[PDB]
């Protein structure tokens, strides 16, 4: 199918970065797409084959290169807050067009801003178990920024899916500030057995997008780097 | 002026009920026309290719297209809470090679709640946080959960989950503030909640 790299990026305002779309489908058209909240897709470029590329809706500020059929560059020179939004790659036969999975990027003035998610995980209440013979724990990953995080539940080793339910979108911690911080909160409900047997090993998995290691960092607190932050439970009786 | 037109929604629609989208677009000349689905944070996938007037299925989906009234339409027949997604129309106009996107349609498939048990229950942290969590659960589909207007006090939409094992789905929201006016009985008030909402102790 279509792979984009990379999945995330921070870039301060004026730095550069490059967007790969790869697909061995032998689809000779490539197209590169911006998604921003309450709009259609907007294309930025589009290539009809092997070293052409043309202009879609929204090319301003993008440079794309069509090296091989297989192949789609998407270059960003000088990043401006705007260029934040989520960039899709696609790829048809002829019309129908498969999508890569996205990029999220985020531009910032200032990098001091992005901070990694603290994650805790709170067990369920008695009165739950009592009164339903259930017992829903929940994780909360919060002052989180910018909303680049993957939650996953494992149970005894394993990702579940099953009793999970996990915000679609995360909340601000202050809606006000426009680079207000975030918290997105899951749960996953188990039977009061399967709880209060302590054989059972509960942990959220918070998987955070933020600087590269390569990023200058001078501040006291830790870098906040791509990182996953974990909070763990056990069963009891 | 818009060139593919879709209702933002969100359209709610019962769990088993026919889920009804629909898709206006102005070139008369267009000739592909496309549904796909988009879960949050995730990337569109292909649900229908149309071409000819009339039906086309391809399990539960049903695509729909008239050029004569410019419309084209999906039906998710036995819709399920994991339909629920952002449905984009896409339409490749007159002499166009790539396709032009509507703004998507957002579908809620709300469970059906067959003893609602409706309750606000407190969570204590497994490890130390200054959080207080309140969680309110096992309400009917109806009930609809507000943000607070109380500074410091968070509250999560609600949010379905499915315990397929015992072929048992249910809603709840999450609460939480470290504030020490925040109590379980007090953290949903900004939402319109059943009396016979349990709060124990
Ligand atoms: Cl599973």
């Known amino acids: 199918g279509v792979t984009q790299t990379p999945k995330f990026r921070v870039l301060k305002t004026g730095q550069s970065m490059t967007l790969l779309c790869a697909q061995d489908?032998?689809?000779?058209?490539m197209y590169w797409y911006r998604q921003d909240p309450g709009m259609g897709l907007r294309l930025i470029h589009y290539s009809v084959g092997e070293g052409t590329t043309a202009k879609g809706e929204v090319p301003d500020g993008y440079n794309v290169s069509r090296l091989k059929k297989q192949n789609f560059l998407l270059g960003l020179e000088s990043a401006a807050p705007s260029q934040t939004s989520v960039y899709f790659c696609?790829?048809?036969?002829?019309?129908?067009?498969?999508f890569g999975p996205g990029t999220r990027l985020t531009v910032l003035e200032d990098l001091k801003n992005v901070f990694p998610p603290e994650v805790a995980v709170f067990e369920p209440s008695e009165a739950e178990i009592s009164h339903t013979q259930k017992a829903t724990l929940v994780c909360l990953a919060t002052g989180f920024y910018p909303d680049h995080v993957e939650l996953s539940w494992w149970v005894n080793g394993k990702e579940v899916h099953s009793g999970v339910c996990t915000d679609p979108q995360p909340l601000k911690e202050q809606p006000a500030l426009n680079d207000s911080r975030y918290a997105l909160s899951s749960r996953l409900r188990v039977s009061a057995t399967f709880w209060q047997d302590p054989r059972n090993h509960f942990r959220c998995q918070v998987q955070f997008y933020g600087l590269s290691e390569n990023d200058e960092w001078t501040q006291d607190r830790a870098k906040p780097v791509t990182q996953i932050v974990s909070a763990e439970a056990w069963g009891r009786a | 002026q818009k060139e593919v037109e879709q209702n933002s929604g969100p359209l709610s629609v019962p769990e088993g009920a026919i889920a009804s989208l629909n898709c206006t677009y102005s070139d008369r000349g267009s000739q592909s026309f496309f549904w796909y689905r988009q879960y949050s944070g995730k990337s569109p996938e292909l649900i229908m290719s149309?071409?000819?007037?009339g039906d086309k299925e391809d399990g539960r989906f049903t695509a729909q297209l008239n050029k004569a009234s410019q419309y084209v339409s999906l039906l998710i027949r036995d819709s399920q809470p994991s339909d629920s997604a952002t449905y984009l129309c896409a339409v490749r106009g007159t002499g166009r090679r790539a396709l032009t996107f509507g703004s998507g349609t957002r579908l809620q498939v709300q469970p059906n709640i067959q003893n609602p048990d409706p309750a606000v229950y407190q969570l204590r942290d497994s490890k130390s946080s200054d959080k207080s969590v309140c969680l309110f659960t096992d309400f009917d589909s109806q009930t609809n959960v507000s943000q607070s207007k109380d500074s410091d006090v968070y509250i999560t939409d609600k949010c379905v989950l499915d315990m397929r094992s015992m072929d048992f789905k249910s809603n709840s929201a999450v609460a939480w503030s470290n504030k020490s006016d925040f109590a379980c009985a007090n953290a949903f008030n900004n939402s319109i909640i059943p009396e016979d909402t349990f709060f124990p102790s």
């Open positions: 696609a790829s048809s036969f002829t019309d129908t067009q498969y």
């Open positions: 149309i071409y000819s007037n």
């Open positions: 489908m032998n689809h000779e058209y």
